[PDB]
């Protein structure tokens, strides 16, 4: 049993630490938890679909899951218009049904099945200190993850394609036939500065690179999984790490924290794998769209927007970036690295092209800039859209703000959790996680500092 | 024997809620201050004093309800229910803001009662009365902000109103009109509050991470006995850690705990002195040398001059609704605004 | 041992007057670089075009500031989030005009304090301590990271990071309130509960321990001489302190367990500061404080103002005045 503090050493509020060496019950906790994740995905999708009005933009309706399905090319057509909601329904139902299976297995292993697995099965049993068994289970899961990355590839290349906001002629679903295999391109993303105008991997701006990256990741993970099934950790690794359940948990907490901060930046800046048709404009995008909107309006009124000097001496509509490119003026000078399909037709080799601006702006571009300017990702916690001084009227908070804020919060606490468990695993492996031995206090055996 | 000593016996019985002689003052005044606030925020308007809704009954939420100050025309009237303004009319009294002085005054006497309670219990138990002494800082703040500040101004109207958003308004009022962030007495208050929070965190964390292993549990709270003679954590190890991390460390536990009182108590007392100055508009508003330079040199700009422009925006944009008795009408052409906004 | 191992032994030595350690190997040079650049810039740097509109703001003492007005001014809005090291400028004079010092300082500083946090873990491990003082320090680190890095990223420019100065800090706070209504955000309200409560509990704990010091001195001695560094016996009577505080409120509102009490002292301000750091870090993506502007409406449709609407008037005053030459279009969208 051991389900009290006296036998386990852990109080009720740390009760899940009683599971560290109970592989059967711990398996149940994990499988049941996976059921919770899958349950939410299914139920939240059905809720979104039940509330979905197909002629409003997704981002006017508080949707975060239907946008993920639509980006995969399901249910949408040119411009992101919803042509068929049944794929959303299918994804929701199948996740919900599947969570019943996972919940069943989790409850079974948690309260009915064998509490430890080692006596029952040497294959499924494990000791956290068995380094080879640890790398074997890691390897199984690397193979599973690699297969998952190749399912994205298969969707993009063989099962209808993906939604491409950059498709020539307008955003549309497109089959990817020439994924980028050149490692100079794929791993070049990894070596880009994360700072402005570069953006590290968040800068990926076409589906060929996205798909080719997942081909590489798929093969890397499968190959790495095979490697870890067939090898045991090298001496330099053995001497460098702590080998314990809590230590391994701490490593994954640090990893998930890093991934969480990355996803925060992805949804905030990237408009390729987070199409603005579904998620709303980015912050940079909407600020650029405002400058575009008033350039169009004032030029229609007769303004020569190239020669218009603003109050500071910089161009009111157009100015130079620090390296000379023609960019929108006003505060949006900070956002000149922005790139979007409604704006790029106006860009030439030297930046924004004054001749294209004077002659070639289409009504669809004016419409899009007006739409994005008035759906900027600003709004209140009670979902009043607009700046902080806005009056109540518009019920709006951008999906990009919900997704960025939630994942910064989660990534932050997971970094704290990494520090907590990494520090504790170190102390526990060295034998002083419960406090200082009064009869063997290390500082009492050290020379004084002065 | 003697009715006084018999009464003293009963007041000081060891019971679930200690009463004491101080309780005769504390309990009615505290109950009425809290009950008045709950009554006003639930049912009472600020329409006739401020032009504001302020109760759950009118549609406000927990963040926006308040018991608001009386109208400026009331001056510093005690606004007693039986006084010449309300003349015993309970309904009119609420509409005139009588609950504000009710809460402020019963609150003041309740705080007196509470500090007397700290003295009384310390004397009965046999401890030194440092907890009461530390409580002088809350009292200094309450008296300077809710009584002395409005008494220096035109009326109770400009005291803080008892509400969450009402208090936020008070903060921004003090920025725009008093430049209160510039005031070195407020700055010392901030250092004492943040410094106190720092001491709270670092001391709690240090004790919990220099604990001796006094039990076998991985949860370590049970391995303490209130009656034990021994320190539960190592001052020696704690001292070496901070000496090597930060360069200095406590070595004297008595000084450490006195310092934890000294820092926040002193900070609040300093902030109270600055507010006494603001009662008279005796602000740290400007640096004269800054203004002389900026007036003569239109290229000279600092964060100080930037913040005054913000203050000027606050005053012009907030005063007409925030000071309705002034009947301000500011034609929009006179409102200070930067470009476009 | 070999020379590398001798070096490792010195780096990780528990006998250095100041602990170095592997985190210190990164911390020491980065904090030195940040400190030296900050001191020189605060004294002598020329004005900086913070908002990229060729309107340089003077931050240094020699250019007309005092301690209260002085600052190291954030880098130019024309730079945005671009990385602007010294060697990207054509000259030091250009670097100074565009606010190069700010970026050098905040990036070295942030590395330094992250390593200061790791170093707190590291020494606790070398001394046989429990490890979590560094978790308490993660709260101030999160708060500094929010205002120097996360908020600029969300808004697209280090020109919107907090300036390195006293009045520049206030400028950042006022504009933040105008643009996010942070006062109405529950995470900042938790921050206030964290620091008001932390100050309250510091004073409470200080006063309760001091109130129950055991008599060991005469009236002509400081009572502090009644405690000797490293003595084994506790120096105050916690049963007396609990007997006092439990009667001040009621018995079960008072801690009798010193370990529980000190955990509470750690957790309350640390959690409050975590949430207020997350407030800044999420308003960085424009999820802002509660907006009850015009929430109360009468039977005809007239707005009945509340205190939230008065707050809104103050926010408007700051909104329309801030960066008075920088906006050309009607909405402030970052």
């Amino acid at each position: 049993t051991n389900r009290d503090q006296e036998s386990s050493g852990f109080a009720w509020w740390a009760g899940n630490a009683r599971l560290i060496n109970l592989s059967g019950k711990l398996l149940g906790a994990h499988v049941a938890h996976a059921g919770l994740i899958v349950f939410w995905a299914g139920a939240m999708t059905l809720f979104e679909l039940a509330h979905f009005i197909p002629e409003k933009p997704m981002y006017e309706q508080g949707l975060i899951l239907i946008p993920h399905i639509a980006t995969l090319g399901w249910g949408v057509g040119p411009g992101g218009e919803v042509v068929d909601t049944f794929p959303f329904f299918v994804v929701g139902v199948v996740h919900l049904i599947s969570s019943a299976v996972l919940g069943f297995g989790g409850v079974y292993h948690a309260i009915r099945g064998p509490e430890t697995l080692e006596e029952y099965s040497s294959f499924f049993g494990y000791d956290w200190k068995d380094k080879n068994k640890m790398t074997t289970i890691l390897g199984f899961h690397l193979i599973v993850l690699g297969i998952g990355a190749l399912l994205l590839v298969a969707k993009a290349m063989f099962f209808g394609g993906l939604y491409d906001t950059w498709a020539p002629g307008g955003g549309d679903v497109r089959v990817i036939t020439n994924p980028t295999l050149d490692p100079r391109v794929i791993f070049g993303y990894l070596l880009k500065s994360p700072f402005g105008g570069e953006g590290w991997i968040v800068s990926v701006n076409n589906l060929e690179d996205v798909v080719g990256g997942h081909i590489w990741i798929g093969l890397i993970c499968i190959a790495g999984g095979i490697w870890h099934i067939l090898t045991t950790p090298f001496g330099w690794a053995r001497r460098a790490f702590i080998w314990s359940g809590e230590a391994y948990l701490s490593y994954s907490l640090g990893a998930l924290s890093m991934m969480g901060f990355i996803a925060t930046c992805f949804v905030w800046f990237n408009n390729t794998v987070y199409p603005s048709e579904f998620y709303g404009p980015t912050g940079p995008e909407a600020s650029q769209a405002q400058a575009m909107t008033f350039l169009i309006r004032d030029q229609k009124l007769g303004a020569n927007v190239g020669s218009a000097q603003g109050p500071t001496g910089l161009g009111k509509y157009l100015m130079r970036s620090p390296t000379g490119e023609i960019i929108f003026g006003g505060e949006t000078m900070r956002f000149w690295d922005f790139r979007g399909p409604w704006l790029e037709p106006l860009r030439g080799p030297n930046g924004l092209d004054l001749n294209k601006i004077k002659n070639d702006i289409q009504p669809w571009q004016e419409r899009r800039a007006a739409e994005y300017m008035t759906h900027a990702p600003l709004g209140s916690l009670n979902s009043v859209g607009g700046v902080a001084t806005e009056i109540n009227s518009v019920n709006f908070v951008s999906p990009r703000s919900w997704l960025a804020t939630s994942h910064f919060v989660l990534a932050f606490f997971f970094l704290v959790g990494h520090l907590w468990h990494a520090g504790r695993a170190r102390a526990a492996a060295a034998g002083f996680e419960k406090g200082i031995d009064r009869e063997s206090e290390p500082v009492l055996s050290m020379p004084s500092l002065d | 024997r003697g009715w006084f000593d018999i009464l003293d016996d009963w007041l000081k019985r060891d019971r679930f809620v200690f009463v004491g002689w101080s309780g005769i003052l504390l309990f009615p005044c505290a109950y009425l201050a809290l009950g008045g606030w709950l009554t006003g925020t639930t049912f009472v308007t600020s329409w006739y004093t401020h032009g504001l809704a302020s109760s759950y009954l009118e549609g406000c939420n927990f963040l926006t309800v308040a018991v608001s100050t009386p109208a400026n025309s009331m001056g510093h009237s005690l606004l007693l229910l039986w006084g010449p303004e309300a003349q015993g009319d309970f309904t009119r009294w609420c509409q005139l803001g009588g609950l504000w002085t009710f809460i402020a005054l019963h609150g003041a006497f309740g705080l007196i009662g509470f500090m007397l309670r700290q003295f009384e219990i310390a004397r009965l138990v046999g401890v030194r009365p440092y907890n009461a002494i530390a409580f002088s800082a809350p009292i200094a703040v309450f008296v300077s902000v809710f009584l002395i500040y409005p008494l220096g101004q035109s009326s109770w109207f400009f005291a803080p109103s008892f509400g969450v958003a009402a208090i936020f308004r008070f903060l921004l009022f003090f920025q725009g009109f008093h430049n209160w962030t510039l005031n070195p007495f407020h700055m010392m208050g901030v250092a004492g509050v943040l410094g106190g929070a720092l001491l709270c965190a670092i001391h709690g964390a240090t004790v919990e991470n220099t604990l001796f292993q006094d039990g076998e549990g991985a949860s370590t709270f049970r391995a303490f006995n209130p009656t034990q003679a021994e320190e539960t954590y190592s001052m020696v190890t704690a001292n070496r850690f901070w000496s090597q991390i930060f360069g200095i460390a406590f070595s004297n536990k008595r000084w450490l705990h006195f310092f934890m009182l000294f820092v926040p108590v002193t900070g609040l007392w300093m902030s109270a002195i600055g507010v006494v100055g603001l009662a008279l508009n005796l602000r740290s508003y400007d640096f004269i040398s800054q203004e002389i330079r900026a007036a003569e040199d239109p290229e000279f700009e600092t964060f100080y001059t930037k913040n005054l422009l913000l203050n000027e925006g606050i005053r012009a944009w907030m005063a007409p609704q925030d000071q309705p008795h002034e009947n301000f009408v500011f034609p929009e052409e006179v409102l200070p605004r930067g470009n476009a906004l | 041992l070999n020379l590398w191992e001798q070096f490792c032994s010195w780096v990780t030595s528990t006998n250095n007057r100041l602990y170095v350690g592997w985190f210190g190997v990164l911390m020491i040079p980065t904090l030195l670089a940040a400190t030296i650049c900050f001191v020189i810039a605060f004294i002598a740097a020329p004005p900086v075009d913070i908002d990229g509109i060729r309107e340089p703001v003077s931050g240094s003492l020699l250019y007309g500031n005092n301690i209260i007005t002085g600052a190291v001014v954030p880098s130019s809005n024309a730079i945005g989030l671009h990385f602007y090291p010294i060697w990207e400028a054509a000259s030091l004079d250009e670097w100074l005009y565009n606010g190069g010092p700010y970026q050098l300082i905040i990036f070295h500083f942030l590395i330094g304090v992250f390593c200061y946090m790791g170093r707190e873990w590291e020494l606790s491990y070398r001394l046989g301590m429990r490890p979590w003082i560094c978790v308490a320090y993660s709260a101030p680190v999160a708060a500094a990271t929010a205002v120097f890095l996360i908020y600029p990223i969300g808004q697209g420019s280090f020109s919107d990071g907090m300036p390195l100065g006293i009045s520049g800090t206030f400028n950042f706070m006022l504009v933040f309130q105008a643009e996010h209504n942070i006062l109405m955000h529950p995470f900042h309200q938790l921050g206030v509960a964290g620091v008001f409560g932390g100050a309250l509990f510091s004073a409470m704990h200080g006063s309760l321990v001091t109130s129950s010091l055991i008599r060991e001195t005469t009236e002509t001695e400081s009572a502090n001489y009644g405690y000797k560094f490293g003595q084994e016996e506790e120096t105050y009577n916690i049963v007396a302190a609990h007997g006092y505080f439990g009667r001040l409120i009621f018995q079960y509102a008072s801690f009798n367990n010193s370990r529980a009490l000190h955990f509470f002292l750690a957790a309350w301000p640390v959690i409050g500061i975590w949430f207020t750091a997350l407030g800044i870090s999420t308003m960085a993506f424009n999820l802002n404080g509660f907006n009850f502007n015009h929430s109360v409406v009468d039977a005809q449709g007239n707005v009945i103002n509340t205190w939230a609407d008065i707050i809104n008037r103050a926010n408007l005053g700051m909104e329309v005045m801030h960066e008075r030459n920088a906006h050309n279009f009607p909405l402030d969208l970052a």
Binding site: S448, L449 | G247, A249 | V39, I43, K228, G230
Partner: peptide
């Protein structure tokens, strides 16, 4: 004159840090 004064006070504080760390009263166990 004002700049000299501010920098002077700052420099005294830095010096004080140095003495307070390296020339502190040494903690002694008794």
């Amino acid at each position: 004159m004002e700049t000299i004064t501010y920098v002077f006070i700052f420099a005294c504080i830095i010096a004080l840090f140095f003495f307070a760390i390296f020339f502190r009263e040494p903690p002694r166990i008794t």
